[PDB]
Amino acid sequence: LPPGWEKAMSRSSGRVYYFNHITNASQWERPSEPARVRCSHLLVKHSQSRRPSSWRQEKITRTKEEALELINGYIQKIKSGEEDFESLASQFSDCSSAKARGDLGAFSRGQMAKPFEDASFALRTGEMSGPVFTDSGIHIILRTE
Ligand SMILES: O=C(N[C@H](Cc1nc2ccccc2[nH]1)C(=O)O)c1cc2ccccc2s1
């Protein structure tokens, strides 16, 4: 199995799914490296985020736990089709890339914080990460190219 994928078993179901420790993604189907990628993301800052401040809110005061409850709620809407990544990124992302629908443009290794970079490079085109953690907050990353 490819970059950082692993067999896991469902607690509710008893069915084998697959989990990516690098991207924190999980899917049911058995999964199937480039020089540059392009990613969008939705960032939710928390009180130990680097700059606890954003265009949404001048002091960010939510805790690491509450940030992850948000990221998990957003992930549910996105995965359920009830809203899409872009619309949620524009509305809710604490990153100023919110206005470009979360788009960060194309990049290569060396450019971005490493947790984010590894997740970016381990995603497949069109694939969405689970929650990924950097000193900035907790990201949901969507690899577009
Ligand atoms: O790194 C940035 N600044 C942070 C948010 C952030 N933190 C990151 C950590 C890793 C990768 C991208 C990231 N973006 C902020 O706005 O507080 C960027 C802002 C913008 C705005 C427009 C285009 C690219 C970028 S990259």
Swiss-Prot record:
The modification Phosphoserine is found at residues 53, 90. Changing residue 53 to D/E: Loss of peptidyl-prolyl cis/trans isomerase activity, nuclear localization and cellular function. Changing residue 17 to A: Reduced affinity for KIF20B. Residues 1-32 form the WW domain. GO terms for biological process: cellular response to hypoxia; negative regulation of amyloid-beta formation; negative regulation of cell motility; negative regulation of ERK1 and ERK2 cascade; negative regulation of protein binding; negative regulation of protein catabolic process; negative regulation of SMAD protein signal transduction; negative regulation of transforming growth factor beta receptor signaling pathway. It is found in: Nucleus; Nucleus speckle; Cytoplasm. It catalyses: [protein]-peptidylproline (omega=180) = [protein]-peptidylproline (omega=0). Changing residue 95 to A: Loss of peptidyl-prolyl cis/trans isomerase activity; decrease in DNA repair of double-strand breaks by homologous recombination slightly less efficient than that observed with wild-type protein. No effect on RBBP8/CtIP. Phosphorylation at Ser-53 by DAPK1 results in inhibition of its catalytic activity, nuclear localization, and its ability to induce centrosome amplification, chromosome instability and cell transformation. Ser-53 is dephosphorylated upon IL33-stimulation of dendritic cells. Disulfide bonds: none annotated. Pfam families: Rotamase, WW. Keywords: Acetylation, Cell cycle, Cytoplasm, Isomerase, Nucleus, Phosphoprotein, Rotamase. PROSITE patterns: PPIC_PPIASE_1 (PS01096), PPIC_PPIASE_2 (PS50198), WW_DOMAIN_1 (PS01159), WW_DOMAIN_2 (PS50020). The WW domain is required for the interaction with STIL and KIF20B. PANTHER family: PEPTIDYL-PROLYL CIS-TRANS ISOMERASE, PEPTIDYL-PROLYL CIS-TRANS ISOMERASE-RELATED. Peptidyl-prolyl cis/trans isomerase (PPIase) that binds to and isomerizes specific phosphorylated Ser/Thr-Pro (pSer/Thr-Pro) motifs. By inducing conformational changes in a subset of phosphorylated proteins, acts as a molecular switch in multiple cellular processes. Displays a preference for acidic residues located N-terminally to the proline bond to be isomerized. Regulates mitosis presumably by interacting with NIMA and attenuating its mitosis-promoting activity. Down-regulates kinase activity of BTK. Interacts with STIL. Interacts with KIF20B. Interacts with NEK6. Interacts (via WW domain) with PRKX. Interacts with BTK. Interacts (via PpiC domain) with DAPK1. Interacts with the phosphorylated form of RAF1. Interacts (via WW domain) with ATCAY; upon NGF stimulation. Interacts with PML (isoform PML-4). Interacts with BCL6. Interacts with FBXW7, disrupting FBXW7 dimerization and promoting FBXW7 autoubiquitination and degradation. Directly interacts with RBBP8/CtIP; this interaction depends upon RBBP8 phosphorylation. This is Peptidyl-prolyl cis-trans isomerase NIMA-interacting 1. It comes from Homo sapiens (Human). The lineage of its organism: Eukaryota, Metazoa, Chordata, Craniata, Vertebrata.
